Design an enzyme around this catalytic site. Structure first.
Site: not given
Ligand SMILES: O=C(O)[C@H]1O[C@@H](O)[C@H](O)[C@@H](O)[C@H]1O
Ligand SMILES: *[C@@H]1O[C@H](CO)[C@@H](O)[C@H](O)[C@H]1NC(C)=O
Ligand SMILES: *[C@@H]1O[C@H](CO)[C@@H](O)[C@H](O)[C@H]1NC(C)=O
Ligand SMILES: [Cl-]
Ligand code: NA
Length: 333
Positions: A151, A171-172, A193, A224, A226
């Site tokens: 992240d 990731d994020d 992400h 997102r 979440k």
């Molecule tokens: O983006 C996300 O929510 C998820 O992405 C996945 O690839 C990761 O393994 C999770 O730990 C979480 O970070």
């Protein structure tokens, strides 16, 4: 008032001007700076962190009204010595977060290179905290998909502005996990992400968030919100997306979901989402052929969500289950 080692760092009390020279943080040590109120801390070299078994944070700075002048220097986390494709979910220990920034002030113009996993943890704050012109360069983590949970910014804090930053990761780009009055503006995110609120856990409340002017490319999600399916006594309220340009999205352009860690299915009701808008400048999102444009999966959502300025193209239609909220306008269905 010049820090040349981890032990010098403990000796800066009384310094209104600190120079942080370059050096290696040896295995088994951390770099902790508690500068005087209102001090300027100027980086004059790169800080490299030898491979370590310690938990993060490996670097912590905590002060009030700090002026941190990075001069384009680097905190090098040696992440490729740890990355194994499993991140913080399993596998090798990953020191995380790499950096922790607490208190208040303005932090400018440095780079985090190759964090082991999550790069910069922000909060708590005691007044406004601005991060401006920071690069999180975890691009090397793309090789063989070994970087994970990298992240850029994890925020649990009030009164934060993150602007003019660059994140290349897995990731994020940002995950806003708790706090009020958070602005993420004019950043560039790639590889990861997307721009996230959450995952929202029990007892956490995110409010008054502005996501404005950002570019997201080559990412799994665009934006997102979440919430963990199981979360209770939690909320997200007052989110404005304005002027974001997003493309190259693999999974969902927009996913607003109370089913986490799943994307959809049997959404929770204990982390209500309210007042989520796409207004101001156009937020335009282009998704890949196998991606979904927009899915909203609410167990408990409220308000008049003005999505007039959202345009999502490419891929296939998602599904809208908005509970009590009414979503108006925009182009995505
Ligand atoms: O983006 C996300 O929510 C998820 O992405 C996945 O690839 C990761 O393994 C999770 O730990 C979480 O970070
Ligand atoms: C971690 O991976 C190992 C195998 O590499 C597996 O045995 C273990 O069950 C995984 N961890 C958890 C918590 O499941
Ligand atoms: C910090 O945040 C809390 C809640 O947002 C608030 O009471 C305080 O006024 C904020 N402070 C500043 C300096 O913005
Ligand atoms: Cl060690
Ligand atoms: Na956090």
């Amino acid at each position: 008032c010049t820090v040349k080692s981890v032990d010098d760092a403990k000796d800066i009390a009384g310094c209104s001007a600190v120079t942080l020279n370059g050096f290696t943080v040896p295995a088994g040590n951390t770099l902790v700076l508690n500068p005087d109120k209102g001090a300027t801390v100027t980086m004059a070299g790169d800080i490299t962190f030898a491979k370590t078994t310690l938990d993060g944070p490996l670097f912590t700075i905590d002060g009030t009204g700090i002026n941190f002048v990075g001069a384009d220097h680097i905190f090098d986390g040696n992440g490729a010595l740890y990355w194994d494709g499993k991140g913080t979910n399993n596998g090798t220990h990953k020191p995380h977060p790499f950096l922790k920034i607490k208190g208040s002030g303005t932090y400018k113009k440095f780079e985090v290179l190759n964090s082991p996993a999550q790069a910069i943890s922000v909060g708590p704050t005691d007044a406004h905290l601005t991060l401006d012109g920071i690069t999180v360069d975890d691009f090397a983590g793309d090789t063989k998909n070994l970087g994970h949970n990298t992240d850029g910014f994890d925020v649990s804090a009030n009164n934060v502005t993150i602007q003019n930053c660059i994140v290349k990761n897995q990731d994020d780009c940002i995950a806003i996990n708790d706090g009020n009055n958070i602005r993420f503006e004019n950043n560039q995110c790639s590889g990861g992400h997307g721009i996230s609120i959450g995952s929202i856990a029990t007892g956490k409340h995110v409010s008054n968030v502005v996501i404005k002017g950002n570019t997201v490319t080559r990412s799994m999600y665009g934006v997102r919100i979440k919430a963990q399916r199981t979360a209770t006594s939690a909320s997200v309220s007052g989110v404005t997306y304005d002027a974001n340009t997003i493309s190259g999205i693999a999974k969902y352009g927009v996913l607003i979901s109370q089913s986490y860690p799943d994307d959809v299915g049997n959404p929770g009701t204990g982390a209500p989402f309210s007042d989520v808008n796409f207004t101001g400048g156009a937020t335009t999102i282009k998704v890949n052929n196998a991606a979904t444009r927009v899915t909203v999966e609410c167990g408990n959502c409220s308000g008049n969500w003005n999505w007039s300025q959202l345009t999502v193209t490419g891929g296939k239609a998602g599904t809208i289950k908005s509970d009590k909220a009414k979503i108006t306008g925009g182009q995505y269905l």
